[PDB]
Amino acid sequence: ATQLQQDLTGKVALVTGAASGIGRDIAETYAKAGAAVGIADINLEAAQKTVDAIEAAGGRALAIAMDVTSEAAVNDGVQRLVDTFGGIDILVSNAGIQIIDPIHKMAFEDWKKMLAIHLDGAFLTTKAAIQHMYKDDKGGTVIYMGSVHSHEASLFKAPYVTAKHGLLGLCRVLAKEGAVHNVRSHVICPGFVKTPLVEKQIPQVVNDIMLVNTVDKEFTTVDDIAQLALFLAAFPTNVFTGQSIVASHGWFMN
Template identity: 65%
Template sequence: MQLKDKVAFITGAASGIGKEIAIVYAREGAKIVIADLNQEAAQATAAELKAAGGQAIGVGADVTDEAQVEAAVQAAVAAFGGIDILVSNAGIQIVHPVEEFSFADWKKMLAIHLDGAFLTTRACLKHMYAQGRGGSVIYMGSVHSKEASVLKAPYVTAKHGLIGLCKTVAKEGAKHNVRANVICPGFVRTPLVEKQIPEQAKTLGISEQDVIKNVMLKETVDGEFTTTDDVAAVALLFAAFPTNALTGQSLVVSHGWFMQ
């Protein structure tokens, strides 16, 4: 088992990509903390992992709330004795052209994606540093950490920002053997993406099928969505990698949508 007895704190993990990462980590022996805005769903996901033979707890946390984040991390430490892996995955999507974006929605997007990443990182790093056994910080970026798309100004801005945060954490964390990396998926057909399809169709004046074919998957090499399995495989690589040789990096998983 690649993650035996490691403690993984995963935000936005009650569904979608976060849940798939939790399943893979649990299968590899990690103790899982499912942190989600929906506490009931977090606990239900944790119960699924335990039923499958894993160790897990579910905690409710709004990642934009400093006190809630600190309390959730403390609950994780109390349950499992430390934090070895942070997966900062919580996110939402709101789509509008820039001239129609409300300031409130702009601030909400940046708060969840960037403030949430900062608050969870800060809370987890304190424990990673103190326990002296290193750690791995993993940010859920996007192809939009590298590219831009119409209608997504705050999302693109936030996802670009995660790369800067990652590089700083990689430099600061190195002396503590803490690595930091970013996963940059293409479109994954999660509820977040499903919600965007009709929204973009309406805004762009095209069919939902055209949104999928000519907007979301246009630049891929094969017209295929990235899967939660694809993303979880990269999350396992970053979590299990044994040295600082792999840190401060961003890996794109997008069927060739963006090539470096």
């Protein structure tokens, strides 16, 4: 007989985009599970508010100014975490934005900004993290925040769908490369969640366009994603390495 593992005591996690939404719930969930957590965001003030809440709730956290499009900012922020907490056991590459336009109208600047945040961010944070994890084959976990848009398309989201599909590719290479150093990789693929990234979109409908391909017309929640991220991060074996897991109430059945 067995039981679920969820203790991250002694572990150090870095979550990008951790000032808000899904990242913030993953960070606070990891801190409640006993991890020391780096709150990495381009918004340093918002990151420090998250850290203050985590510390008041009895956890350990560090606010890290990090534009994930910048090699220097990624390398310096990972080093700050390692200097502060002694290492890095978990990376969640979660920072993201949305920019909506049809391909024939979309600015090339907006295309490149989307790939810079979603794909360059994923590459830079992965490379920095695994350089530490590969030391003495101690290993670690890398989770990418994908989407149902890793697996299928929607109108007017060309660069987002391109990026979220690409994150599967990066995850699958890291599973192969990382195996020899005890590094496992996963992609979590949510459906729509009522974060600021989405409550933004609703004004600029729920049952008829956004939840139309769910089986039950339910939003995915931040706690759905944070529970799956804790289950993966705490998992005692590398059995899930290379996998994507869709959390979408039946929108794309993987």
